[PDB]
């Protein structure tokens, strides 16, 4: 079975991406998967299945639940996604460690600005810009060093916004996720085609569109 998220969880997957982007020295092991989860939630359940069946699937339903876990001696509640490719243990640990980082940011500059927060609507698309680069290198794996050099150029402002935007750590998760699941490549190519078929929007959506076309 494989996780097929619909539109309903797209906002939750974006907050997952953002919690990673705000974490100081973030573990980007699951970033390659979460990025693909976000692009799937943008396509929907029906589309993701259609792409994977046409390419040549056991569709898993993704809904939000409440898991009660004990942290620092007391039990706490957390919003988690029903995923087979990502455990609740992995999901909860991204949150508490992003909370420690937010707590640290708060001690430095008081209450955090929308564009520096994990719940910013850009987060998931910022991540997708890294794999748009990784796809551009695979289409034409030694090109890792050029993805890092490109990410510093076009994602300068965004890298200035988030401490967890570590291109090397992120790019590598997509390289690995595309190698260990080649079906995500077809998912992402379809995603970016439907995405570059929008004549405006946001700055990140604008960098993604330009980066995707380069490939």
UniProtKB/Swiss-Prot annotation:
The lineage of its organism: Viruses, Riboviria, Orthornavirae, Negarnaviricota, Haploviricotina. It is found in: Virion; Host cytoplasm. Encapsidates the viral RNA genome by forming a left-handed helical nucleocapsid that protects the RNA from nucleases. RNA replication depends on the availability of soluble nucleoprotein. The encapsidated genomic RNA is termed the NC and serves as template for transcription and replication. Together with the phosphoprotein, sequesters host NF-kappa-B in inclusion bodies (IBs) thereby inhibiting this host defense pathway. May also act as a modulator of the innate immune response by sequestration of host IFIH1/MDA5 and MAVS into IBs. Signal peptide: none annotated. GO terms for molecular function: protein serine/threonine kinase inhibitor activity; RNA binding. It comes from Human respiratory syncytial virus A (strain A2). The keyword Cell membrane does not apply. Tyrosine phosphorylation modulates viral transcription and replication. Changing residue 38 to F: Increased transcription and 50% loss of replication. The gene is N. Belongs to the paramyxoviruses nucleocapsid family. The modification Phosphotyrosine is found at residue 7. Residues 1-215 are annotated as: Interaction with the phosphoprotein. Keywords: Capsid protein, Helical capsid protein, Host cytoplasm, Host-virus interaction, Inhibition of host innate immune response by virus, Inhibition of host interferon signaling pathway by virus, Inhibition of host MAVS by virus, Inhibition of host MDA5 by virus, Inhibition of host NF-kappa-B by virus, Inhibition of host PKR by virus, Inhibition of host RLR pathway by virus, Interferon antiviral system evasion, Phosphoprotein, Ribonucleoprotein, RNA-binding, Viral immunoevasion, Viral nucleoprotein, Virion. The keyword RNA-binding applies. One of its GO terms (cellular component) is helical viral capsid. It comes from the Viruses. One of its GO terms (biological process) is symbiont-mediated suppression of host cytoplasmic pattern recognition receptor signaling pathway via inhibition of MDA-5 activity. Homomultimerizes to form the nucleocapsid. Binds to viral genomic RNA. Interacts (via N-terminus) with the phosphoprotein P (via C-terminus); the phosphorylated phosphoprotein P binds to N-RNA complex. When in a monomeric RNA-free form, interacts with the phosphoprotein (via N-terminus). Interacts with protein M2-1; this interaction allows the association of nucleocapsid with the matrix protein. Interacts with host EIF2AK2/PKR; this interaction inhibits EIF2AK2 phosphorylation of EIF2S1 and blocks EIF2AK2-mediated translation shutoff. This is Nucleoprotein.
